[PDB]
Amino acid sequence: KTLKFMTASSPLSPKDPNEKLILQRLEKETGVHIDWTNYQSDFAEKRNLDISSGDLPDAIHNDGASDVDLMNWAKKGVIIPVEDLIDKYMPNLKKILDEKPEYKALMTAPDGHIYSFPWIEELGDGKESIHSVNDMAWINKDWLKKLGLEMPKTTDDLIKVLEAFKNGDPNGNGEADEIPFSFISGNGNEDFKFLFAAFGIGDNDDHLVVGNDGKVDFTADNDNYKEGVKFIRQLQEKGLIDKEAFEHDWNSYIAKGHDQKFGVYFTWDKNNVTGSNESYDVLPVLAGPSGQKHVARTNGMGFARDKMVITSVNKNLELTAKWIDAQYAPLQSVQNNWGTYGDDKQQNIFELDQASNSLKHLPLNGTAPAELRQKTEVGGPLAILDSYYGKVTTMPDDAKWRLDLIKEYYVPYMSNVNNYPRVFMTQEDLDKIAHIEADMNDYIYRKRAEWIVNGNIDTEWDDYKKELEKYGLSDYLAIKQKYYDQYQAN
Numbered sequence: 001k002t003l004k005f006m007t008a009s010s011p012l013s014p015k016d017p018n019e020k021l022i023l024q025r026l027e028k029e030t031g032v033h034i035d036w037t038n039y040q041s042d043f044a045e046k047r048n049l050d051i052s053s054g055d056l057p058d059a060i061h062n063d064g065a066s067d068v069d070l071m072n073w074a075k076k077g078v079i080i081p082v083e084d085l086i087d088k089y090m091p092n093l094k095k096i097l098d099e100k101p102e103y104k105a106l107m108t109a110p111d112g113h114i115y116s117f118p119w120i121e122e123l124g125d126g127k128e129s130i131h132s133v134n135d136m137a138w139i140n141k142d143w144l145k146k147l148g149l150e151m152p153k154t155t156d157d158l159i160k161v162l163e164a165f166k167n168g169d170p171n172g173n174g175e176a177d178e179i180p181f182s183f184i185s186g187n188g189n190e191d192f193k194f195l196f197a198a199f200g201i202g203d204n205d206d207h208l209v210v211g212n213d214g215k216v217d218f219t220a221d222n223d224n225y226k227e228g229v230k231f232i233r234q235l236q237e238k239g240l241i242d243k244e245a246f247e248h249d250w251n252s253y254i255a256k257g258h259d260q261k262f263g264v265y266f267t268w269d270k271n272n273v274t275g276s277n278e279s280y281d282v283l284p285v286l287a288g289p290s291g292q293k294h295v296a297r298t299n300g301m302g303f304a305r306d307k308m309v310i311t312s313v314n315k316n317l318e319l320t321a322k323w324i325d326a327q328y329a330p331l332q333s334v335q336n337n338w339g340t341y342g343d344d345k346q347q348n349i350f351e352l353d354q355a356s357n358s359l360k361h362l363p364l365n366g367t368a369p370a371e372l373r374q375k376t377e378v379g380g381p382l383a384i385l386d387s388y389y390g391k392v393t394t395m396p397d398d399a400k401w402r403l404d405l406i407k408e409y410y411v412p413y414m415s416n417v418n419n420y421p422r423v424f425m426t427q428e429d430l431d432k433i434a435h436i437e438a439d440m441n442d443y444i445y446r447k448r449a450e451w452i453v454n455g456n457i458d459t460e461w462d463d464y465k466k467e468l469e470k471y472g473l474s475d476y477l478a479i480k481q482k483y484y485d486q487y488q489a490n
């Protein structure tokens with residue numbers, strides 16, 4: 001009747017998840033009450049403390065564990081394999097794996113086991129996938145018009161435009177408050193690395209792309225990569241970059257965005273940052289000095305291996321298996337991912353069409369989509385399939401919109417036929433990767449920011465590449481190539 005789950009949630013959502021409208025209804029439908037350990041910041045560190053201290057719940061919900069954490073917890077009996085539970089008790093998930101057996105392959109570790117329950121969300125395929133580009137570039141069209149500038153078409157045009165922003169007071173308040181170029185450095189949706197491809201190849205959060213020769217490329221040791229750093233260095237030297245770019249956080253970014261202080265900035269959806277207005281639009285793909293005109297593909301996709309694991313201290317496997325499966329009901333999945341209907345005390349993402357027993361997205365009327373979603377979503381293991389649109393739920397209008405934009409502006413410039421596939425390496429290979437990445441990942445972003453602030457990449461470039469080799473890049477790259485080959489050979 002009672003299970004104890006650990007979970008992750010947004011600091012905008014209730015400290016107690018049972019305050020969420022979805023979870024109140026779910027209790028009345030499963031008849032299972034969940035007592036939550038809900039971490040709303042630094043979830044992974046806090047999860048690792050609990051596991052290390054032996055302070056295990058029945059299951060970790062909305063977990064987001066890496067594959068190396070999954071295999072290590074599995075080698076040690078922290079979590080259990082779950083395939084027999086799916087076959088015995090999970091008809092909603094079994095039906096999904098019937099329709100789309102490809103995901104079953106993605107859930108199966110090389111030792112034949114399944115250790116987690118995935119998040120599945122189909123929104124585009126291949127180049128047209130909503131994940132192809134995460135850190136989209138946006139520009140203040142109102143400043144362009146005010147200053148009589150055309151949309152920039154090249155990186156050189158971008159510099160000239162940005163200097164106008166710094167110097168031309170297009171907000172008209174008589175102060176040089178204009179921030180020409182902003183970002184939030186590192187992984188994720190507000191980084192600037194989307195522009196590195198205007199110098200050829202570019203970059204992504206993996207620092208990994210697949211060349212058309214079949215050979216994976218570590219992007220962050222290319223000359224094109226150095227040229228992109230040199231480009232941002234020009235912007236810094238020219239006083240075009242947000243004074244705060246390497247210190248501020250999301251909440252500060254969004255404050256500035258709401259005051260419309262940005263010339264060009266990066267984000268998933270401008271509505272989350274500069275709001276619902278036509279002051280900002282997509283910065284179209286720019287041509288580099290030599291006519292480079294490219295969009296690097298991310299390796300992202302509408303699949304996450306682990307949004308739930310089951311711990312070895314879980315004493316009612318059947319009930320837990322059946323609770324989980326209730327999330328894989330179409331209508332439930334839709335809500336768990338995106339929000340709910342019929343709250344009279346808070347804005348609703350959905351309305352319930354009782355005529356069709358189906359969900360209809362409502363208009364946000366200026367509410368930031370990520371803001372209302374964070375409060376009312378649940379996360380966790382769920383599947384939303386392409387066959388659900390027009391049947392179970394409307395497609396979200398911000399997802400349909402973004403997909404249109406990806407087709408319009410970006411897909412024509414994705415010259416790479418392949419990106420890196422979602423492979424499940426062996427545990428021996430995962431721990432090798434994890435040792436190299438322990439050195440490499442921080443180091444790459446550290447050098448990148450030092451180089452934009454000092455100006456010595458040209459003097460430091462070769463030492464940096466040797467250092468990456470001492471950290472094991474060739475080994476790192478050889479492993480990734482092996483799995484790409486095995487994936488292509490099937």
Ligand SMILES: OC[C@@H]1O[C@H](O[C@]2(CO[C@]3(CO[C@]4(CO[C@]5(CO)O[C@H](CO)[C@@H](O)[C@@H]5O)O[C@H](CO)[C@@H](O)[C@@H]4O)O[C@H](CO)[C@@H](O)[C@@H]3O)O[C@H](CO)[C@H](O)[C@H]2O)[C@H](O)[C@H](O)[C@@H]1O
Pocket residue numbers: 008010064121130188189268269272369370373374377379396398399402
């Ligand atoms: O790193 C912490 C960890 O991140 C994990 O997920 C997030 C994103 O979760 C959301 C994502 O919401 C969107 C993107 O959603 C889709 C694509 O899946 O895009 C469509 C709209 O264009 C939408 O229909 C699709 O579902 O991302 C923007 C905000 O960036 C939203 O407007 C949009 O819905 O992020 C939201 C706010 O955090 C959350 O409500 C959503 O679930 O990964 C990125 C980090 O790289 C997010 O920070 C993180 O949320 C993981 O789910 C986990 O929950 C933690 O966030």
Ligand SMILES: [Ca+2]
Pocket residue numbers: 169170171172173174175176177178
């Ligand atoms: Ca001004």
Ligand SMILES: [Ca+2]
Pocket residue numbers: 217218219220221222
């Ligand atoms: Ca390379």
